[PDB]
Design a protein around this ligand. Structure first.
Ligand code: CLA
Ligand code: CLA
Ligand code: CLA
Ligand code: CLA
Ligand code: CLA
Ligand code: CLA
Ligand code: CLA
Ligand SMILES: CCCCCCCCCCCCCCCC(=O)OC[C@H](COP(=O)(O)OC[C@@H](O)CO)OC(=O)CCCCCCCCCCCCCCC
Ligand SMILES: CC1=C(/C=C/C(C)=C/C=C/C(C)=C\C=C/C=C(C)\C=C\C=C(C)\C=C\C2=C(C)C[C@H](O)CC2(C)C)C(C)(C)C[C@@H](O)C1
Ligand SMILES: CCCCCCCCCCCCO[C@@H]1O[C@H](CO)[C@@H](O[C@H]2O[C@H](CO)[C@@H](O)[C@H](O)[C@H]2O)[C@H](O)[C@H]1O
Ligand SMILES: CC1=C(C/C=C(\C)CCC[C@H](C)CCC[C@H](C)CCCC(C)C)C(=O)c2ccccc2C1=O
Ligand code: SF4
Ligand code: SF4
Ligand SMILES: [Cl-]
Lengths: 141, 80, 73, 69, 750, 40, 143
């Protein structure tokens, strides 16, 4: 958020990384600490060597960051659960994304709002003849 | 952006969140099931619509529904 | 399979009876069912209809496409 | 008014077993919208493409059922 | 099971005594090899998934030592199957053919090795091939092989079939033995240096050695009499030549000297049967057997010498690990480091090489047999020539795509990124987009500059503008390189090959050899119509390579799917999101590459079949002139799509549709049948299972209405299985159509 | 043993045995009395 | 009346009588062609020389369609009835699907050998009410 501290991973460069639109429009960065120096697969292609301690890597979109995060904790015995994914703007504006409230979205947590929650069954959706000519869908109401 | 809803038939098993590859879904404490939790979709802006949640639903027919909508750069999964 | 084996005398050739009979109901005599307009004694012919003589001549002349003679094909 | 081992017919319309008859497995205490857990002899559609079968159990509500036996 | 002693003598032999017992209880339990299927069928899909994973041993067990022991016995079983099939051919030649009736007058009769049972009118399929025999005229060229091998009596083929069945029993037994009695450990396998030594020195060396010995003692002294004009009943037996070595010493002047000169480095004296004539045999139209025996002897020596390069137990020899770790340059970093470990652990990594090379070599076999006919009277049998060529084209075409499949399988299942850190594979994985986009551009270029030429020629000839065409009579596109190498091979016997008497093949240029009334091989003049079709072939192969390569370079992940490696090798998609993620797996890429392999070989075989009938094959006049079948219109009509539509398809398909009432009627039947299966595949290839499951819902309601629904709930085919049935039926219908068409056309040219 | 008696009675083995038996029936019947476009 | 005036019997047909002397042999019997010449000479023919079959329901040609129709329907009802009864018999044994994959030969044969009375069994199941089901008891989809 304030600063993106981290060492760039050992990698000989690849063509699957970020592009011109990815630098001008938006790019994503992920920061994590490695217990030691090991090899990890790049979500863009190839195999890289993560530095010992705090690491930093910039990617094109968010799904790449989350795919690397789901790889870090599952393949290595010193599992990495402190990987933090940030979205970077063209104005240097960096905001927090994953994890949201410091806890993984898997398990429940106190302090979250119900978004998209409905109080009905799918077989209880209204008929499309009652809402036609209105800018609303059977699921939006 | 796509629309993600969660119905009261949800048993709160976190499977749809464990299968989501873009941190779109979360889990909030509820009072309907034994687990006392229900799925939530706060960050619909990161939802591509790969239906990985609906695939990982246990209830009789889905309890979470995804309705594709106006596709954008983020929903189209554009990396270039 | 039956023609390829030099035995064209075993083809299941179904005669379209239900349609040729309808053709006979309007004046087609090549099949000779003697039903309705194909039969000179049906009360449908003795009606003094002005169109009957033209229709009966047009249907049975082997030059036009009016109710073509059909078969198993 | 159900117990373990009762034959009930599903009336959830959108359900895969709507019209089929399943067996009650166990009923949870109060405070739950769908406490009646029912097992079925026939799997549903659930599962990824190419799966071997599906799920043969689900939770329902009492106003959605009809005892037979 | 049984208990033998030990069978070893200070070797790397390592087995396990009775690992898997022998029982039949697992036979009544289908799908037991998979944990997901053993709990019983709950849907009909459970049945399909049973066959879709019957041989996939990775999903079954994770222990590689078990998988290798399975694969060894699987190969033994395949060899048993093959020996059964081959004994079938020998027995049908012994008791259901006219090999003896053909060997007498080979130029006035047709080969036939099948008799159709006269029933419900199918007895008409027994065509009079000549000499009083009635049967199906074969095209596999078995009589030519059996003549070049020295077969003269039916009892010989009978004993060959008996030996084939014995070897089938032996391979079937060895399979069970190497998995139920003493299954080898991993110590016996991973000796790739030792295995290469043994497969070069013993298999491919001693094999050609013994076959050359056979030819010198069986094939040559009997084919020499067959080519002279001697009756087969008057020709002696092969063992009468060893029982009387003087009869062999006399029949070849070199044989009149003994065996000592060979050991005393006097090779040049054996020039009376180890010849280097080249060309063909003016009596049979095939290659000289005196040259083939010498060739097999040379190949034998070469392979036995090659089997002594790698290190085994006596210290000497190489280790491929050393050679791979040594090769590294400034362009590839570490080079081949880790490749030995890749190919010594991953079976799919090995199969992706073996399949590629075996398919390429099958294609080479076809391309070499068609132009240098090695069997007697096969160049006159245009049907047999075309059939062998196209069959060995299709086998190789399938085996090549197998490599692109198993490479992606290796990528998803066996690629460890920690084991590939900046080597060939790892660095190739980096610039995937570079290679793929460059091949994309190359394929687009080859599509415009090969097919657009045909479109332009069709539009010009349609507009009535002959001076604007790419023909031999307008804007010529002459192939200079191919004609130059043709002329090089023509001038070989008098320059870069003084010992060679004739050229390798008469297709490059030279004389015109003809047997009976038909031609065997003549110079294949290459012009514009050949240049264009060669570029068409190159384009189609390039697109197929692009597809099957993007299937491997993106099986791990991509900008679309970064976690694709989790999804496995075979999966339909990853949801309709991201605009649509349909057909992204390596399995889908192989599904697509099958079609392009078919489309490439469809033009290859048509190029062959029309160029041979137009500019090569044809009756020869007694004065010397040669009149081709299609009157040599290939160089003047094969340049437009309408030419292939009319003068190739419409013109040469008449033999198939007019085949009713004859012995070739089955070919017209199968022609229409392939036309049927082709269109049947389109139902699967154009639809989706979401409609078929909803229809099965109504049919299930109908069955439950009368209470006749199976406990095995019916489920439509999976998306992957839908695509698989589609492509399978597409290929089946197309290949059946082309097979029927080619056979009916080639049998109807005399 | 019953392990092989259950394999000989599986769906594919039995569905091919019945097809072979019915093929034999039809083939022998149309051997001894072929060409039956209809009933005399 | 003069039904099928455009059709003449094979005994009178011109092209048929021309082709019947030159009939091929299906089986090993050389007379099979002349056997066909004598066998098909009773049916009605067309002006091309090929026999035609009339299926409008007349009894003159009950050997053309009626006999095969009845024989089929008999054998097909046999097949379907023994299949349905065996499918119901499986529903009470151990694992209703495994016995649908692995056939109970001592049971399947016992049910096949009792299928020659499938009409009576079907009528007895319809009168008692075993043949058909009730709509209110069958799983249906949302309307
Ligand atoms: C009568 C001899 C016999 C018996 C009783 C068994 C029994 C058994 N084998 Mg076995 N096997 C045998 C011979 C035998 N095998 C031979 C000769 C080979 C060499 C090919 C093998 C190779 C082999 C392997 C590699 C494996 C087994 C396995 C097994 C076990 C499970 C088999 C199964 O899945 O169901 C039965 C399977 C079938 C009935 C397959 C049907 C036949 C297929 C479709 C084609 C037949 C090809 C055939 C081998 C060659 C053709 C013959 C030729 C005339 C054309 C089981 C206890 C498996 C195991 O141990 O479980 C983990 C295992 O992986 N066997
Ligand atoms: C000179 C000795 C010798 C010979 C003649 C062979 C011959 C053969 N080996 Mg073999 N092999 C050898 C030594 C030898 N091997 C040694 C020392 C090892 C251990 C390093 C192996 C390990 C080995 C494996 C793992 C396999 C073979 C296989 C084969 C067969 C494949 C060729 C084929 O199918 O074509 C046609 C066959 C007959 C015409 C073939 C008959 C393959 C096979 O078929 O499995 C049984 C196979 O997979 N071999
Ligand atoms: C010696 C070569 C070889 C070997 C050992 C293997 C081995 C294997 N392949 Mg493979 N493959 C090969 C060549 C080979 N392949 C080639 C040349 C191709 C290109 C076509 C493929 C394409 C391919 C694909 C796409 C897949 C495999 C898969 C597999 C694995 C599972 C096999 C399976 O599905 O069970 C048994 C196989 C079947 C049940 C297929 C039956 C359907 C056939 C094709 C019908 C053919 C009809 C018949 C031949 C002719 C029609 C006559 C008809 C009228 C009766 C297995 C380890 C699967 C895998 O997951 O990899 C791990 C997979 O999906 N292969
Ligand atoms: C007459 C039908 C037709 C036509 C005109 C094309 C044309 C083309 N296909 Mg194509 N294709 C077809 C049928 C057709 N296809 C079918 C039925 C399939 C299903 C198997 C495919 C599957 C397919 C794949 C997988 C690919 C193509 C590609 C291409 C393009 C290659 C570039 C080129 O040829 O250079 C100049 C343009 C015209 C001559 C080209 C425009 C490739 C591509 O995108 O280019 C790199 C590609 O990867 N096709
Ligand atoms: C030649 C191509 C072909 C063929 C044969 C069919 C055939 C069929 N289509 Mg179809 N279709 C096709 C192309 C084809 N389609 C294409 C290109 C499309 C666009 C994608 C569609 C889209 C389509 C739709 C949307 C639907 C169909 C349906 C049907 C079925 C209707 C039932 C029927 O006709 O009665 C009888 C069946 C036949 C005449 C075909 C069976 C032929 C075989 C040879 C019979 C013998 C079985 C054989 C011996 C099996 C043993 C194989 C062994 C050798 C391994 C039928 C099987 C409808 C359906 O499902 O029916 C309810 C349906 O709704 N089709
Ligand atoms: C599905 C429709 C159908 C129908 C109704 C028939 C009906 C008939 N076929 Mg036939 N057949 C069919 C499809 C059909 N076939 C197909 C698709 C093929 C290609 C494989 C054949 C190939 C075929 C042959 C080769 C022969 C017949 C013959 C016959 C006749 C013999 C009846 C008999 O054996 O006596 C009664 C049987 C038991 C009591 C009969 C009228 C035979 C004949 O000579 O025709 C007169 C005969 O030789 N059929
Ligand atoms: C006991 C087996 C059985 C029975 C009694 C029925 C009965 C029925 N089927 Mg059906 N069906 C079956 C098996 C069976 N089916 C199988 C195995 C399949 C998969 C190929 C189908 C697929 C099928 C379809 C797609 C449809 C029906 C339909 C129907 C209904 C109309 C009849 C018909 O369509 O003509 C004849 C039925 C067929 C040509 C389908 C194939 C019949 C199979 C090959 C015969 C089964 C033999 C069985 C193995 C015998 C077991 C003996 C036992 C002792 C082991 C009818 C009540 C139709 C419907 O919905 O109702 C209007 C319809 O659309 N069936
Ligand atoms: C039909 C041909 C007549 C037309 C002329 C076309 C000229 C072809 C260009 C020269 C060959 C280029 C390859 C050698 C160049 C070469 O391999 O140098 C060697 C270099 C790596 O060598 P290293 O120094 O690393 O050596 C160590 C190795 O042992 C591995 O560590 O490989 C590369 O350059 C990688 C780049 C490949 C991308 C270039 C390949 C271009 C693709 C098209 C090739 C067409 C070939 C057609 C043959 C039928
Ligand atoms: C007069 C006759 C024909 C005319 C025929 C008429 C026009 C056809 C009439 C059809 C009528 C409309 C339908 C007949 C019956 C319909 C009922 C619903 C039949 C139900 C059968 C079901 C209940 C049977 C079920 C179970 C039966 C009992 C045995 C099977 O194993 C298995 C299984 C299928 C489960 C024509 C075409 C004109 C030609 C002429 O020569 C002869
Ligand atoms: C040459 C052609 C050969 C194939 C044709 C002949 C088929 C012969 C069928 C075998 C007859 C015995 O009938 C068969 O008995 C086996 C015994 O395991 C039964 O098998 C079943 O019951 C037995 C116990 O009884 C269980 O242990 C077993 O798991 C279960 O499958 C089959 O359900 C039945 O089909
Ligand atoms: C028709 C169809 C189906 C339904 C296909 C089905 C239900 C397959 C029918 C198989 C029958 C039951 C078996 C008949 C074929 C046998 C394999 C042949 C064996 C014959 C021997 C026993 C002699 C799909 O599931 C599908 C999925 C995706 C895209 C397109 C389609 C599609 O077009
Ligand atoms: S998988 Fe479906 S039912 Fe279960 S917690 Fe997630 S959204 Fe709710
Ligand atoms: S549709 Fe796919 S991307 Fe969107 S929330 Fe569900 S699993 Fe995540
Ligand atoms: Cl033209």
């Amino acid at each position: 958020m304030t600063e993106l501290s981290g060492q760039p991973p050992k990698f000989g460069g690849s063509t699957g990384g970020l592009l011109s639109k990815a630098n001008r429009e938006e790019k994503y960065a992920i920061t994590w600490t490695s217990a030691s120096e090991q090899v990890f697969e790049m979500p863009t292609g190839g195999a890289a060597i993560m530095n010992e301690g705090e690491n930093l890597l910039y990617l094109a979109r968010k799904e790449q960051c989350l795919a690397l995060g789901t790889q870090l904790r599952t393949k290595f015995k010193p599992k990495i659960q402190d990987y933090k994914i940030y979205r970077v703007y063209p104005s240097g504006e960096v905001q927090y994304l994953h994890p949201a409230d410091g806890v993984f979205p898997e398990k429940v947590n106190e302090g979250r709002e119900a978004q998209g929650t409905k109080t009905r069954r799918i077989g209880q959706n209204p008929e499309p003849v009652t809402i036609k000519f209105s800018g609303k869908a059977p699921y939006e109401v | 952006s796509h629309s993600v809803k969660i119905y009261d038939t949800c048993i709160g098993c976190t499977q749809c969140v464990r299968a989501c590859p873009l941190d779109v879904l979360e889990m909030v404490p509820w009072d309907g099931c034994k687990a006392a939790q229900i799925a939530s979709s706060p960050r619909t802006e990161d939802c591509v619509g790969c239906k990985r949640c609906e695939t990982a639903c246990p209830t009789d027919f889905l309890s979470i529904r995804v309705y594709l909508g106006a596709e954008t750069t983020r929903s189209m999964g554009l990396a270039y | 399979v039956v023609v390829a084996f030099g035995t064209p005398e075993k083809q299941i050739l179904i005669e379209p009876v239900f349609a040729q009979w309808i053709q006979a109901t309007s004046g087609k005599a090549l099949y000779g069912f003697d039903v309705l307009l194909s039969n000179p004694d049906s009360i449908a012919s003795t009606t003094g209809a002005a169109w009957l003589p033209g229709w009966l001549d047009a249907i049975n002349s082997g030059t036009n496409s009016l109710f073509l003679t059909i078969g198993p094909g | 008014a159900l117990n373990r081992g009762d034959k009930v017919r599903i009336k959830r319309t959108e359900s895969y077993w709507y019209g089929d008859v399943g067996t009650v497995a166990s009923v949870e205490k109060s405070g739950i919208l769908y406490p009646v857990i029912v097992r079925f002899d026939r799997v549903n559609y659930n599962g990824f493409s190419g799966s071997a079968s599906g799920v043969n159990t689900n939770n329902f509500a009492e106003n959605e059922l009809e005892l037979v036996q | 099971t049984i208990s033998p002693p030990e069978r070893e003598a200070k070797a790397k032999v390592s087995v396990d005594n009775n690992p898997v017992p022998t029982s039949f209880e697992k036979w009544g339990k289908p799908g037991h090899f998979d944990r997901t299927l053993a709990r019983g069928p709950k849907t009909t899909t459970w049945i399909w998934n049973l066959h879709a994973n019957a041989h996939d041993f990775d999903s079954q067990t994770s222990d590689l030592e078990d998988v290798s022991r399975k694969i060894f016995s699987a190969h033994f079983g395949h060899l048993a199957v093959v020996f059964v099939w081959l004994s079938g051919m020998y027995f049908h030649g012994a008791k259901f053919s006219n090999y003896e009736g053909w060997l007498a007058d080979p130029t006035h009769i047709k080969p036939s090795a099948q008799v159709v049972w006269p029933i419900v009118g199918q007895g008409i399929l027994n065509g009079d091939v000549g000499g009083g025999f009635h049967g199906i005229q074969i095209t596999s060229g078995l009589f030519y092989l059996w003549r070049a091998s020295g077969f003269t009596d039916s009892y010989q083929l009978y004993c060959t079939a008996i030996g084939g069945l014995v070897m089938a029993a032996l391979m079937l037994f060895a399979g069970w033995f190497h998995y139920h009695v003493k299954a080898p450990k991993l110590e016996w396998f991973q000796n790739v240096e030792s295995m290469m030594n043994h497969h070069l020195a013993g298999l491919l060396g001693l094999g050609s050695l013994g076959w050359a010995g056979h030819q010198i003692h069986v094939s040559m002294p009997i084919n020499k009499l067959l080519d002279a004009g001697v009756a087969p009943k008057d020709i002696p037996l092969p063992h009468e030549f060893i029982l009387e070595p003087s009869k062999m010493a006399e029949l070849y002047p070199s044989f009149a000297q003994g065996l000592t000169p060979f050991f005393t480095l006097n090779w040049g004296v054996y020039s009376d049967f180890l010849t280097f004539k080249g060309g063909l045999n003016p009596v049979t139209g095939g290659l000289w057997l005196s040259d083939t025996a010498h060739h097999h002897l040379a190949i034998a020596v070469l392979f036995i010498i090659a089997g002594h390069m790698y290190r085994t137990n006596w210290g000497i020899g190489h280790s491929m690990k050393e050679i791979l770790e040594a090769h590294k340059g400034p362009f590839t970093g570490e080079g081949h480091k880790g490749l030995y470990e890749i190919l010594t652990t991953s079976w799919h990594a090995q199969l992706a090489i073996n399949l590629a090379l075996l398919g390429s070599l099958t294609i080479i076999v076809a391309q070499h047999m068609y132009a240098m006919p090695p069997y007697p009277y096969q160049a006159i049998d245009y049907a047999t020539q075309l059939s062998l060529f196209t069959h060995h084209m299709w086998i190789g075409g399938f085996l090549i795509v197998g490599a692109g499949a198993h490479g992606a399988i290796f990528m998803v299942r066996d690629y460890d990124p920690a084991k590939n850190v900046n080597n060939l594979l790892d660095r190739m994985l980096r610039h995937r987009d570079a290679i793929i986009s460059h091949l994309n551009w190359v394929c687009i270029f080859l599509g415009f500059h090969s097919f657009g030429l045909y479109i332009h020629n069709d539009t010009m000839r349609a507009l009535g503008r002959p001076q604007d065409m790419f023909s031999d009579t307008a804007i010529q596109l002459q192939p200079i390189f191919a004609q130059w190498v043709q002329h090089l091979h023509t001038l070989a016997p008098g320059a870069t090959a003084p010992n060679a008497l004739a050229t390798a093949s008469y297709a490059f240029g030279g004389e015109t050899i003809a047997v009976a009334g038909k031609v065997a091989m003549m110079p294949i003049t290459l012009g514009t119509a050949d240049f264009m079709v060669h570029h068409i072939h190159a384009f189609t192969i390039h697109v197929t390579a692009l597809i099957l390569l993007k299937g491997v370079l993106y099986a791990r992940s991509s900008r679309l799917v970064p976690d694709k490696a989790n999804l496995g090798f075979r999966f339909p998609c990853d949801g309709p999101g991201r605009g649509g993620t349909c057909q992204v797996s390596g399995w889908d890429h192989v599904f697509l590459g099958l079609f392009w392999m078919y489309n490439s070989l469809s033009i290859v075989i048509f190029h062959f079949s029309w160029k041979m009938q137009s500019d090569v094959w044809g009756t020869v006049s007694p004065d010397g002139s040669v009149t081709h079948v299609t009157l040599g219109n290939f160089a003047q009509s094969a340049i437009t799509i309408n030419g292939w539509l009319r003068d190739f398809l419409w013109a040469q398909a008449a033999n198939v549709i007019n085949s009713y009432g004859s012995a070739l009627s089955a070919y017209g039947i199968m022609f229409l049948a392939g036309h049927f299966v082709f269109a049947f595949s389109l139902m699967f290839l154009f639809s989706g299972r979401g409609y078929w499951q909803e229809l099965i819902e109504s049919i299930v309601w109908a069955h439950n209405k009368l209470n006749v629904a199976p406990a095995i709930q019916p489920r439509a085919l999976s998306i992957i299985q839908g695509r698989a049935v589609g492509v399978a039926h597409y290929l089946l219908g197309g290949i059946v159509t082309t097979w029927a068409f080619f056979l009916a056309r080639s049998l109807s040219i005399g | 043993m019953d392990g092989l008696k259950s394999f000989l009675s599986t769906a594919p083995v039995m569905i091919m045995a019945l097809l072979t038996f019915t093929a034999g029936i039809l083939i022998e019947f149309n051997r001894f009395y072929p060409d039956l476009l209809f009933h005399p | 009346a003069d039904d099928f005036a455009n059709l003449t019997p094979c005994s009178e047909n011109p092209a048929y009588l021309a082709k019947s002397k030159n009939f091929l042999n299906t089986t090993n019997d050389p007379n099979s062609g002349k056997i066909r010449a004598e066998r098909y000479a009773s049916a009605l023919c067309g002006p091309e020389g090929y026999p035609h079959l009339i299926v409008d329901g007349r009894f003159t040609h009950a050997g053309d369609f009626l006999i095969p129709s009845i024989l089929f329907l008999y054998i097909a009802g046999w097949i379907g009835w023994v299949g349905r009864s065996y499918l119901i018999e499986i529903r009470e044994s151990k694992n209703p699907e495994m016995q649908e994959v692995v056939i109970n030969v001592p049971l399947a044969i016992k049910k096949m050998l009792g299928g020659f009375l499938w009409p009576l069994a079907a009528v007895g199941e319809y009168t008692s009410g075993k043949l058909v089901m009730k709509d209110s008891e069958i799983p249906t989809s949302p309307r």
